[PDB]
Amino acid sequence: NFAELKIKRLRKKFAQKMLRKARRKLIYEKAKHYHKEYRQMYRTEIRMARMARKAGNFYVPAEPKLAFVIRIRGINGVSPKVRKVLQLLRLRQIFNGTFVKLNKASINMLRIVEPYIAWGYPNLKSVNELIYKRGYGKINKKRIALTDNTLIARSLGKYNIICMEDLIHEIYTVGKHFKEANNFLWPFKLSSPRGGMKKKTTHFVEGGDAGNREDQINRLIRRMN
Amino acid sequence: KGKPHCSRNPVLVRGIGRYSRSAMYSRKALYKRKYAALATVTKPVGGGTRVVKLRKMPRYYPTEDVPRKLLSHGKKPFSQHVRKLRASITPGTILIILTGRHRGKRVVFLKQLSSGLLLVTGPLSLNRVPLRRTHQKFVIATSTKIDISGVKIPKHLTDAYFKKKKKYEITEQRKVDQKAVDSQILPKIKAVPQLQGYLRSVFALTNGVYPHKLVF
């Protein structure tokens, strides 16, 4: 016959097309709500500093929950305790980068590899542009470039991370499923820095590049990708 | 049926309209415009009639063929390209042809043509170069302008007019087009003092003069 068998094919096709359209409206409004949340997160740490200075007290802001490590010293001649920490940070090649949340279990790992990494507190623009330009994904333990939202949504759908700004929100606003969202991300293959390093061997305090350079990691990121 | 209106939003930047989709819904007025729901030719012959099959099958097959290509999108043919001008080249400027047989001769520019080329005459009465086409990359444009807003160049001369044919003897239509255009152009350049002597001379880099330091 192929009369109703024909039409139910395009019934099912139209059904999944409308399903895809409802999903796109979903992630549109999720991105809008995120933009509102980031406006509030930026303005409230100005608001509360102002209300502290208005009384004459001081407002200590919260210690940040998210750093971005970069491996600035190469393979050769690495002490093994410094080596295993880098393997758990997934900084294997030179000039790889990884988002890392902070706590006492992680800062004492980062100080073991302080001569070899440069790390600081990455800005919202940094967490955006790293994902969009250099952000890939460990899909089926392969390395597939994040070209469409389905590559994110098939791997991270059960953590309710189904577009790319969901991934950006989970990385930046460090969420509940940060471990899974970050271990989804392949380590960032950042290029050698344009302009050039100050000094590879010594710490940032003593005029170098190794170690914690807190707000200044963004200047490094902008010229490394 | 229906008269096709132009685009409702103005283009803000390329690929972005100035009105989002709610205002575009309100403007296009879809709130009230809701809708809901060959190969055989018979011929007589002088038997009966024959059903001839137009576009019949091939009589030969090459022993192997290539496959079809994948589809790409933003790759127009050359006629469908958008065509750029420089900022310095406006109709009325004077040009320095750098490459072809008219080496370095200063020339009045007339019209951006439809293949992308530049319509050219420094009038051949003084620098001996006809209605010619040139290319805007190969041409230095100095900042010496005449006003040719009040001239008419003929519509019938175009890229298909100046296109080469196949000894080249010139036609009489070239002569009458040249004599029609320069009779309007040449009294304009005779108005500016020492410009007709400027156009006869050739650009030449001498000693101690450098194009990065010299302005024009």
Partner: peptide
């Protein structure tokens, strides 16, 4: 609406509504 199990009648209803 957007997830396919429970939002099926809602997507069908908005499909009827977009005519």
């Amino acid at each position: 609406i957007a997830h396919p199990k429970l939002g099926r009648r809602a997507r069908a209803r908005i499909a009827r509504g977009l005519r």
